[PDB]
Structure 1
């Protein structure tokens, strides 16, 4: 199964920068959401969940087809709460109806990372909407009540290695868990992208507690939280090495996250040899906007 990127007709960097800017301006405007976290973190999760359905074995799922717009996928229990991201993006979809759904969802994640002072994430256009019958079934996204071996095996399906897994999980320094969505509660409630996930793992005093949904989670003296799968990154010696690396080198972490996140968002997509080079969007701050 081949999905060839096809540039939206006549569109170029300037067009997508406009879309980026509209998302970024709305991120700034809609500041109240989730107790003033704003929509950045949920947009990042949305980009990841639309991409994370991919299966390297048969090229099913993946960001290309924009299939989250269909009920089977938007009602996946694994996707509970992402409807907030979808609603945020609705007015952008309306202003720019030419951008494909996969392009929009993934560009929402790029924009969020950047505007939250994260690394630049190069991004390619050309995802093409595919029909409802191409929507992947529920159950391809990961469980949180599992161990390091589960995580490692899980991410092999997405063609991610240990370094890529550990880098991607640094996004758990964004936002929070919400009991009603996932059965976990708490987190940093951060909206600025840092390597704090790694520092907190190493430096906080963690206790394994049960939350109000009767699930186990790791809670810190100082008010942070880690899922069992997060904490597994310091229980496995290979992951622990990499955690320490990223805790001690912000720039390395940013660079590795950027590569892994772009890869995640592009899995399944064949880019023609004469496709445009990836775009690197300027932040509103860089533009003086």
Structure 2
């Protein structure tokens, strides 16, 4: 059946905004996963998982009699899709069980690992999500094999459909770079927001870059991709050597024996894939990656034998039984046990990417320190494994259960505890009146609160107004945030704050984070009053102020808005059209298409544009909250044409006289072009819509202000 996507393959796709409706969710509207999890007997779950580790099933026999390595790989892959550029991927939604990730080639035979967990999932039901269970299972694997983990938090609610994520433009699985849809350009520059080297890989190619078995060059890909997953050199070496302390790879015969991935398999395979024609198709005969490497002399026990081997031998290039490049220890004895035959032993082997840890000079120094000091290795690996598996969980307030680590980590963008009474409704009214009396304008107040709150992204639940990090480096100097204007607003608000807090007794105080949001609320109320309408904008106090020392400036860089259609802002010229970047931002903000539309039309008339640009300011009463954006956009009395100077800016002229009325960008005019967005604009641009527009705007404004408020959940 030919679809709209077939006919108009470049039109904008709004369905990414309308995933995760209550229609597709089997749980009731009132289901609360946190409440279910908090009553889970987590210790009982862990005992069952511990038993599972050595209870082999004949349809996928356990290597060495222990599933621990398989499950560590499973949990690593669950977390390993994460990209810092947009926060998408990661373990936090349990997306490994859906397309496409369930069928990525790098996830081969993890379908078996997930199937092994069904009995436990079935026993505990809604009290433990798949998302939490995948990570917990990796922790229990580690613990069962003698490794002390740093901790665990539950709270990853399950999702019920695939996320819409850009994973690359290639049309062939694992396509080597330089094809018509190459994700590389220039001197091996990987396109943002991607964090893997080939379509269907987690980070890098275990043979080397595009299959070339050079550990030094592989190291460059490792470093780049791991940085794009928020890991530095120390963390990267800890993770790779830690993981590859356990288990083995699978490449017992040629890869042509392996059939369809799960999404392509027959209905009779019942959700499994990669069925192999090679001998028994499993166990001793398994083929997963096509490599055949077992790293340590005790693959089911924590050790420091990975580094002992890495440094204690020299390495020779060889081929697996599937023909993949890998390495074997020169002159070594057969000291590595076989996974099924207790009469057989093997020489030590390594991947190209394992040898990167010795032959890249910066890695080598870390690896040597870990080799000489395995206690340092263990601690770094535990910390990095926690970070890996929790990176997308959001604020520590979301962390559930009895194993949450008490240590507060810089990468968590921590928010201090509140230790004092909060302002009440009367205090909030007093503060709003003081803000408005200071002379701060509607545009200032709205723009500042928008800047503070709209860094949130639901993909990894980073950002938002909590913390008042807009006053700190680097947010205070982001171009989109208008640094000089921002500085002036913050100085005025801080003076109001100081005066209010100095007059209190009893320890009541207001944070700057709360006052920035409250001041924005005052701006929206005043805009409504300018339009002839009395409204109260909801406000919830309880945000706290983070310090500079509690803020990782490098990690905060990825939250810079380089495109923010809600402020008609584009930092430079991109290949992706601006309207597509608007929809991407709306998806990060968790907005529906109606929410996006209302919010944008209101912001335009409130003065939220960066640089006080007139683009899209389709009103003669700026700083009044009206539906003028929609009424004027949809007026057929105005004709629109791209300018000569800039094809992405349009002039709106009176159709009869030629008089110039307005200018607008693609982000403005898409609302009058796209047939679904125009239908939404029409509702808000109708003669009966003033009250609806104001109410819906206040609601979406309050939603955005509260995106990071997991303390109120």
- What is the TM-score normalised by the length of structure 2? 0.37
Greater CA deviation, 133-142 or 44-53?
A: 133-142
Aligned length: 277
> Where in structure 1 do 4 or more consecutive aligned residues deviate above 6 Å?
none
Gaps of 5+ in 2: 1-16, 18-31, 168-198, 209-217, 252-286, 334-346, 406-713
Superposition pairs for residues 110-189 of structure 1, below 5 Å? 110-134=139-163, 136=165, 137=167, 139-142=200-203, 143-146=205-208, 147-170=218-241, 171-179=243-251, 180-187=287-294, 188=296
Gaps of 5+ in 1: 282-289
Q: Determine if contact 1:175/1:190 at 8 Å carries over to the other structure.
A: yes
- Superposed CA deviations along residues 217-266 of structure 1, whole A, max 9, x for unmatched, are 11122412111111011111110111111112222111111100010001
Q: Determine if contact 2:79/2:389 at 8 Å carries over to the other structure.
A: yes
1:48 maps to 76
Task: Tell me which protein shows more helix as a share of its residues.
Answer: 1
1:215 maps onto 2:324 in alignment:
yes
Superposition pairs for residues 6-155 of structure 1, below 5 Å? 8-12=34-38, 15-30=41-56, 33-98=61-126, 99-134=128-163, 136=165, 137=167, 139-142=200-203, 143-146=205-208, 147-155=218-226
Q: Determine if contact 1:201/1:234 at 8 Å carries over to the other structure.
A: yes
2:305 maps to 196
Q: Determine if contact 1:70/1:135 at 8 Å carries over to the other structure.
A: no
Q: Distance in 2 between matches of 1:157 and 1:280?
A: 26
Q: Distance in 1 between matches of 2:35 and 2:302?
A: 34
Q: Which has the higher contact order (CA 8 A, sep 6+)?
A: 1
Q: Distance in 1 between matches of 2:396 and 2:150?
A: 20
Q: CA deviation at 1:172?
A: 0.6
Q: CA deviation at 1:205?
A: 3.0
Greater CA deviation, 255-264 or 114-123?
A: 114-123
Superposition pairs for residues 216-255 of structure 1, below 5 Å? 216-220=325-329, 221-222=332-333, 223-255=347-379
Assess, with a 3 A threshold, how the Cα gap between structure 1 residues 135 and 195 changes in structure 2: closer, same or farther.
farther
Q: Determine if contact 2:153/2:404 at 8 Å carries over to the other structure.
A: no
CA RMSD of aligned residues (A): 2.3
Q: Distance in 2 between matches of 1:48 and 1:274?
A: 21
1:152 aligned counterpart, secondary structure: helix
Q: Determine if contact 2:74/2:138 at 8 Å carries over to the other structure.
A: yes
Q: Distance in 2 between matches of 1:225 and 1:65?
A: 35
Q: CA deviation at 1:8?
A: 2.9
Assess, with a 3 A threshold, how the Cα gap between structure 1 residues 278 and 198 changes in structure 2: closer, same or farther.
farther
Q: Distance in 1 between matches of 2:150 and 2:40?
A: 17
Assess, with a 3 A threshold, how the Cα gap between structure 1 residues 53 and 231 changes in structure 2: closer, same or farther.
same
2:318 aligned counterpart, secondary structure: strand
Q: CA deviation at 1:51?
A: 0.5
Q: CA deviation at 1:20?
A: 1.2
Q: CA deviation at 1:120?
A: 2.3
Q: Determine if contact 2:38/2:401 at 8 Å carries over to the other structure.
A: no
Q: Determine if contact 1:218/1:227 at 8 Å carries over to the other structure.
A: yes
